[PDB]
Write a protein that binds this ligand. Structure first.
Ligand SMILES: *[C@@H]1O[C@H](CO)[C@@H](O[C@@H]2O[C@H](CO)[C@@H](O[C@@H]3O[C@H](CO[C@H]4O[C@H](CO[C@H]5O[C@H](CO)[C@@H](O)[C@H](O)[C@@H]5O)[C@@H](O)[C@H](O[C@H]5O[C@H](CO)[C@@H](O)[C@H](O)[C@@H]5O)[C@@H]4O)[C@@H](O)[C@H](O[C@H]4O[C@H](CO)[C@@H](O)[C@H](O)[C@@H]4O[C@H]4O[C@H](CO)[C@@H](O)[C@H](O)[C@@H]4O[C@H]4O[C@H](CO)[C@@H](O)[C@H](O)[C@@H]4O)[C@@H]3O)[C@H](O)[C@H]2NC(C)=O)[C@H](O)[C@H]1NC(C)=O
Ligand SMILES: *[C@@H]1O[C@H](CO)[C@@H](O[C@@H]2O[C@H](CO)[C@@H](O[C@@H]3O[C@H](CO[C@H]4O[C@H](CO[C@H]5O[C@H](CO)[C@@H](O)[C@H](O)[C@@H]5O)[C@@H](O)[C@H](O[C@H]5O[C@H](CO)[C@@H](O)[C@H](O)[C@@H]5O)[C@@H]4O)[C@@H](O)[C@H](O[C@H]4O[C@H](CO)[C@@H](O)[C@H](O)[C@@H]4O[C@H]4O[C@H](CO)[C@@H](O)[C@H](O)[C@@H]4O[C@H]4O[C@H](CO)[C@@H](O)[C@H](O)[C@@H]4O)[C@@H]3O)[C@H](O)[C@H]2NC(C)=O)[C@H](O)[C@H]1NC(C)=O
Ligand SMILES: *[C@@H]1O[C@H](CO)[C@@H](O[C@@H]2O[C@H](CO)[C@@H](O[C@@H]3O[C@H](CO[C@H]4O[C@H](CO[C@H]5O[C@H](CO)[C@@H](O)[C@H](O)[C@@H]5O)[C@@H](O)[C@H](O[C@H]5O[C@H](CO)[C@@H](O)[C@H](O)[C@@H]5O)[C@@H]4O)[C@@H](O)[C@H](O[C@H]4O[C@H](CO)[C@@H](O)[C@H](O)[C@@H]4O[C@H]4O[C@H](CO)[C@@H](O)[C@H](O)[C@@H]4O[C@H]4O[C@H](CO)[C@@H](O)[C@H](O)[C@@H]4O)[C@@H]3O)[C@H](O)[C@H]2NC(C)=O)[C@H](O)[C@H]1NC(C)=O
Ligand SMILES: *[C@@H]1O[C@H](CO)[C@@H](O[C@@H]2O[C@H](CO)[C@@H](O[C@@H]3O[C@H](CO[C@H]4O[C@H](CO[C@H]5O[C@H](CO)[C@@H](O)[C@H](O)[C@@H]5O)[C@@H](O)[C@H](O[C@H]5O[C@H](CO)[C@@H](O)[C@H](O)[C@@H]5O)[C@@H]4O)[C@@H](O)[C@H](O[C@H]4O[C@H](CO)[C@@H](O)[C@H](O)[C@@H]4O[C@H]4O[C@H](CO)[C@@H](O)[C@H](O)[C@@H]4O[C@H]4O[C@H](CO)[C@@H](O)[C@H](O)[C@@H]4O)[C@@H]3O)[C@H](O)[C@H]2NC(C)=O)[C@H](O)[C@H]1NC(C)=O
Ligand SMILES: CC(=O)N[C@@H]1[C@@H](O)[C@@H](F)[C@](F)(C(=O)O)O[C@H]1[C@H](O)CCO
Ligand SMILES: CC(=O)N[C@@H]1[C@@H](O)[C@@H](F)[C@](F)(C(=O)O)O[C@H]1[C@H](O)CCO
Ligand SMILES: CC(=O)N[C@@H]1[C@@H](O)[C@@H](F)[C@](F)(C(=O)O)O[C@H]1[C@H](O)CCO
Ligand SMILES: [Ca+2]
Ligand SMILES: [Ca+2]
Ligand SMILES: [Ca+2]
Ligand SMILES: [Ca+2]
Lengths: 388, 388, 388, 388
């Protein structure tokens, strides 16, 4: 009916409670579950759904061979009911492509899928499930976007894209859409030196995105967007609690305005909630690989270059595989505050488990509680030996 | 539109007619049916559905091995259309966990799932399909709840939980929720010495729950809740017709205010309708194992310590497997009275049928008739040899 | 919104056009299609659906063995979208049992399922998808009903039941329901000597049912019901064009008020439209077995004991299997007249094709045209050898 | 609510962006995907869907053997959600037959299916999902229609049919339907000598159809219909850019009013958008077989017998299989102009890939952009060796 406005602050995060989990790889061992990766969660005013990029084959299907590859003509953004698995029969295709974002503005949903060969990709922006706008590649090198939900305020839904090198300077743009049309775009500004796969959330008329500096940084760049002024800033999380992967060991002092060095030309999509003392960071447990996942309460991580954890919660054990992670909230919930949520992609198969010829994932997702809840760990749960 | 009020009495129960049956194990021999256990039935104002705890794998799936276990990260409360089986493609996840309850208040549904390791479990209370409240374990020993529907009156939906030992005193609480928020909770009072898995129904502004004393009692404890005053009482069914399992042979006199002794540290979820002469008790036929199921009309069972059956109906033959059973009613039906209903869980596989490596169930459910109807028996119907 | 009234006459039937066909046995060779038999079609004001009695297993499932049997605890009335097959995932259970009828009254649907052992069966009458009324067996010998849709007028939906012998006099009753409640019932009157499986249609405030005299008659009994007066009459179709199966060869003169003799203790559900010159009869082509199906225009068949065909249409070749057939119309269509429709059940498997251990069917259905359309034949289409 | 009127012109076509793709053959290797051919796309005011003719078996099913044949009793027009595959469980049958068209008039949808033996076929015209009108064969030789969407204006939906020889003069008629009823029909007029499988679109109260002259022409006939006057004209595309298949090499001058000769008794359904300088033609890349697909901008193709391409876009590489192609638009989109769209059928299996015994297809579909977007190619993507 009316466009949603970001009028609330974050609820106090004292722990994380289980929100959804689809067990897709367990179930897909013997049912028609699509191979996916790059999953996320996003809410409409009346429903919240799981999203991901299909690979256009089931996991048991012979076409699952080769699905380690990120980009093909067979990928599409799909959505499906919360905590069900992405099956052939219940998955709704939002648009065709191999990089995506999607968000609801309070009236209807915008979905964006990018497709094409590496040197000639284009984004199509869908609004109310019809294509409205198209954007051609500007740097001819894998035009790509968030892989988790965008955020809207009064109809304005900013979206971060990158086109150019994954291993040196690239051309990142912030587009401000409304009803699927471009109001404005700007080149990246501020002190973030490289941006990929931004994870975003909105509170009190500001949108905060935690991104991946693939080039040099093991601290995460942060873009903050004013969706009214349609302007932004960028920096890094100051905290020495480093949250990319792979990454070096944690130091005692981080960097606010430069990449924290040690690891080049690699990373993983991740996220954080940056809200003064109410600040929580996600990271893999392993510094070397996408294994384990934990949440750490790091008061003032964004601005305090010596901030260390005051509390934490393990999400996935270090003996279990993790993957991309990202933020979403139910902007249409009851109550006085927005409840922070996140998902973690649990990647199975190649390259770490190469006795199968496929790569897929399942999803686990949590939201914050004002209680101090007991923790469990939440592995994918599938036995790779069953697929042999 | 408005909250439902328990304004009607029970219809006269003169027999039981078949209401629903999903044949899940028969069908799941060759289709994508999820492994479940702890099923139940619950109605919305416009639909009634089957509910259960998924095990996050199909029955033919290789992950069905090990599903005798009650608690894993792969379980969730699911619902699906009445008398269909719980399949991968038609099952709707209500929330994630390994103990649950759910009920509709006339406006929308509350669902509660508990998850966690044994010493650190938490309940999440969902209302209008969003998480609202969380409750951490208080005794650090398998926080657990009804495994069948709760009941609401004017928006107040009491729920019984237990945390603590299954084989000695435990800490049982009655929470009174409204819109997913805690109005009040109380510790168990009265003469029931141990409470698990309460089966509840509502009539004339009172809610009656028939529970399982796992510790000492082969008679069933009964909690009666006034959802206006938000107060309760507890006792046992007085009747010598004993209704837990396993249990000793029936005596001639029961116990009103103490466990009837003979069997320790075991039991099964069960139910009854306690309404003066219109009183019917469910039980397994076998005193030793979860086989068979019958309904017995035991006038004044609750209050008369010498009451014996005046009528009965066999539901499941003693040569067929039964399991948990519980009560629900369609509070939104037409007419002057609430029609008592129940389900029986028909457990197949381990431990009684150990040539398969799984444990699952199907559901049969009946409601009362004012006629004296002919009886059939209603087995699960699957042939275990087909799964070998 | 308002109850439907039978205010229109039949459209002129000049031929039959294809309406629906599900190819269930072809498709079910390699997908999760339920075994059924006793199918039919029925319309709501906004949709028309296929109906049948499930056998509670898929066709490829190992539980399909033994499905020649008519009555088990695993059967249910299911419905599913027009011309789709009855699958595990798209079939909606209306009620549990092994004999059924269903019709919409303009406001909501009534469905009736009978279940039980042979000597102790009961009907449950569901209205607005809730059980309302129950009827116990009166003759203790397979209480059974139409196996095709009932018809309503101003909320009154008459239903024909039989209880008693299939091979001698039985006790047939016409119940007049409204909102699932019994307004009245009457014992069969008139000159029909035995009634089973009535096929009904309504026009100009009268309901006509064409039934099966299993005992002695190879002509079909006809019940005509006034749903306002709640009274009926019965006789036989006068025509020498005999329409039961098996049956003797056609004579030159039929019988109006007695069974036409020659074949005892057998028959098949069938139907006709009896409307003066606009009269069409269905029958199997074979006099000996359920093979082939044809429509014959037999002016005044009901009343003229020498009436012979003036036109016809082959529906199923004599080299293809047929089965039960029955009538329905879309009472909520546009226009000035009700368009006659019918289905034919195409039975596959046992007893005629005994290299498989199952029995199932698919459905073909046609409606009348005022054109003189070209005919095709419409076989089930499945290859039994594929199932070996 | 009101009938749609064709009040807009075409948007400027500067390139084509990906719209939908179902990957049906890849997915159907290991899931219950129906065999189809003759697919298309059509929109309702609130949804756009894929359509095709089922063959009434899954691809892995043993009944897929023999599905090279165009006409059987097992075919039906089905629809399913955009970019999902046509599965047993999500496909909605529109009507039964082996040639079809369908379109929405702004109020509800008309669907037309033709069935029958070759010498005795009939069309049934469905409106608001009920049969309304029937049309018997007039030339007794495979009555057949568009195999892609029709177009409506103020309730009038013209439809082109052909009955008669595929290899000499035939009898083509334009029927003008409204609410499923025949307002008028006319025989083909103008200079087109043979018409099959018209692909249509509407703009500014005129409907343009690009058809297939199977008899003599390798240029495509064009019918232009005034749906207010209910009159039409026909000619050929003048352009030497020849767009049927198979076809001779392109000359320098085409023919406006006669078939361009070179290839007899063959062709493929195809389409074009004819709008002065904004004119784009589809064709296979190969002159000999249904391989590859490209779009060429050929200003004034309809009227200029020397027009050559000024721009183009490859859709499918010449090393990949193509098939039928056709036009549709979303008439209910926002904005000032109608966005041209098309699909291409990607045929797999027989006759070109005869190591499998089946023939099926997947779908790819694009719509126009006012940007000059980078191109990719969009193959079916399935590996035939996996099906062996
Ligand atoms: C039932 O469930 C409940 C609820 O979940 C469970 O309770 C939870 O238990 C977990 C596990 O213990 C806790 O998570 C950890 O939290 C600590 C932070 O809390 C500690 O420190 C606080 C701050 O201390 C500072 O200030 C205070 C005064 O302000 C001062 O006293 C102190 O000296 C210091 O200067 C303390 O306030 C806090 O105490 C409070 O809480 C206690 C309960 O935990 C209670 O006992 C106290 O009385 C008091 O109330 C407490 O001491 C996190 O630091 C920790 O995270 C580190 O460790 C894990 C490994 O366990 C690691 O994975 C993390 O990455 C992180 O450590 C790495 O990073 C650091 C920062 O750079 C670095 O310093 C470390 O060396 C280490 O780095 C290495 O590994 C990383 C990752 O691989 C790598 O990248 C690096 O390169 C390097 O190799 C955990 O998050 C929960 O907070 C707690 N929750 C609650 C509500 O209590 C309960 O256990 C369950 N019950 C059962 C029976 O199972
Ligand atoms: C078509 O369908 C219809 C409808 O379903 C079928 O009819 C049904 O038939 C069934 C099976 O017979 C009946 O169920 C049983 O009901 C009896 C209760 O009814 C009897 O007793 C009544 C009360 O008697 C007392 O009062 C009267 C006067 O008030 C006095 O005369 C009498 O002496 C006594 O003091 C009688 O009123 C009643 O008579 C009436 O109804 C008759 C019809 O049944 C009719 O003939 C009469 O004229 C009159 O109208 C009748 O006599 C239940 O007692 C019984 O349940 C016990 O038995 C089964 C085994 O069959 C068992 O599983 C139960 O658990 C239970 O027995 C155990 O528990 C007892 C209590 O503690 C204990 O005392 C027993 O020793 C036994 O305990 C052992 O086993 C248990 C369980 O394993 C274990 O835990 C213990 O430790 C121990 O080992 C049945 O429920 C239906 O009521 C009846 N329904 C109707 C409407 O009629 C019909 O059969 C079908 N037709 C066909 C052709 O198949
Ligand atoms: C394209 O499609 C079109 C449309 O579908 C196809 O045209 C259709 O063609 C079929 C097949 O031919 C026709 O079906 C048959 O219809 C006849 C009835 O029509 C005939 O008889 C009419 C009445 O005759 C009487 O009155 C007139 C004057 O009023 C008088 O002249 C006459 O002597 C007699 O006294 C005639 O009016 C009618 O003529 C009209 O139509 C003609 C077109 O057909 C046209 O040529 C004429 O000029 C004129 O306009 C015509 O002669 C049915 O009788 C017949 O059904 C019998 O036969 C089939 C076997 O074919 C059988 O299965 C049936 O059960 C039935 O025969 C059995 O039952 C009889 C009754 O008891 C019994 O008498 C028989 O001995 C036989 O009994 C045996 O078998 C049964 C069953 O196994 C068993 O139970 C018994 O015991 C015993 O063993 C067909 O239904 C369509 O009507 C026709 N439709 C149209 C609109 O034309 C066209 O063919 C297709 N084109 C192509 C190229 O394929
Ligand atoms: C990133 O993506 C972008 C966007 O997709 C990619 O850029 C696209 O690149 C493709 C491939 O190159 C282009 O498609 C072709 O377009 C040409 C038409 O454009 C050319 O000609 C125009 C008209 O020329 C005439 O007028 C001008 C002045 O008005 C005059 O100068 C000239 O001499 C002539 O008289 C030129 O205007 C145009 O130039 C413009 O654009 C250029 C970019 O392309 C730029 O460089 C220029 O500066 C200027 O701005 C350009 O020269 C089509 O002709 C062509 O289609 C033919 O060729 C393909 C094979 O490639 C074939 O399949 C087609 O069927 C067709 O050729 C057949 O048919 C002809 C007509 O009958 C016949 O003449 C031919 O002999 C041939 O016939 C044979 O094959 C067929 C089919 O098998 C058979 O039936 C016959 O019998 C016979 O055997 C392509 O469609 C895109 O237009 C271009 N898009 C854009 C926006 O730029 C970019 O490449 C990608 N980047 C990367 C890095 O990959
Ligand atoms: C899930 C898992 O086993 N993660 C381990 C993790 O438990 C650690 F032991 C680790 F050494 C690590 O990289 O931290 O290796 C991970 C993994 O073996 C990477 C190379 O294959
Ligand atoms: C479908 C079919 O083959 N029907 C034939 C039919 O074609 C006839 F040849 C028949 F002899 C018949 O009963 O009429 O036999 C039927 C069948 O063989 C019954 C005994 O098995
Ligand atoms: C898809 C494909 O391989 N198309 C080729 C295509 O690449 C060409 F090489 C062609 F020679 C052609 O017909 O143009 O043959 C097609 C095909 O082999 C037809 C006879 O089998
Ligand atoms: Ca990095
Ligand atoms: Ca006990
Ligand atoms: Ca008979
Ligand atoms: Ca041609």
């Amino acid at each position: 009916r009316d466009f949603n406005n970001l009028t609330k602050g974050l609820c106090t995060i004292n722990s994380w409670h289980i929100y959804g989990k689809d067990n897709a790889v367990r179930i897909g061992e013997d049912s028609d579950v699509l191979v996916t990766r790059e999953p996320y969660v996003s809410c409409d005013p009346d429903e919240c759904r799981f999203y991901a990029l299909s690979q256009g084959t089931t996991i048991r299907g012979k076409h699952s061979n080769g699905t380690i590859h990120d980009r093909s003509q067979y990928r599409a953004l799909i959505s499906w009911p919360l905590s069900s698995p992405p099956t052939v029969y219940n998955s709704r295709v939002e648009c065709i492509g191999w990089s995506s974002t999607s968000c609801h503005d309070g009236k209807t949903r915008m979905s964006i899928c990018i497709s094409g060969p590496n040197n000639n990709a284009s984004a199509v922006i869908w609004y109310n499930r019809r294509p409205v706008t198209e954007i051609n590649t500007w740097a001819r090198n894998i035009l790509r976007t968030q892989e988790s939900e965008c955020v809207c305020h009064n109809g304005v839904c900013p979206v971060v894209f990158t086109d150019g090198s994954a291993t040196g300077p690239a051309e990142t743009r912030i587009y401000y859409f409304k009803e699927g049309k471009i109001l404005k775009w700007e080149p990246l500004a501020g002190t973030a030196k490289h941006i990929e796969e931004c994870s975003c959330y909105g509170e009190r008329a500001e949108i905060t995105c935690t991104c991946r500096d693939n080039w040099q940084g093991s601290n995460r760049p942060v873009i903050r967007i004013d969706p009214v002024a349609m302007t932004h800033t960028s920096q890094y999380i100051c905290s020495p609690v480093l949250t990319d992967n792979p990454r070096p060991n944690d130091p005692t002092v981080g960097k606010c305005n430069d990449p924290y060095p040690g690891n080049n030309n690699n990373g993983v999509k991740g996220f954080s909630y940056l809200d003064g003392v109410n600040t929580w960071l996600g990271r893999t447990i392993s510094i070397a690989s996408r294994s384990g996942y934990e949440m750490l309460k790091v008061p003032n991580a964004l601005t305090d270059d010596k901030s260390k954890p005051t509390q934490g919660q393990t999400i996935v054990l270090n003996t279990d595989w993790s993957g991309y992670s990202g933020s979403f909230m139910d902007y249409w919930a009851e109550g006085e505050c927005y409840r922070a949520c996140f998902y973690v992609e649990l990647i199975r198969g190649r390259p770490k488990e190469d006795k199968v010829w496929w790569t897929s994932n399942s999803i686990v997702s949590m939201c914050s509680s004002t209680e101090f809840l007991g923790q469990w760990d939440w592995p994918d749960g599938a036995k790779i030996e069953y697929f042999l």
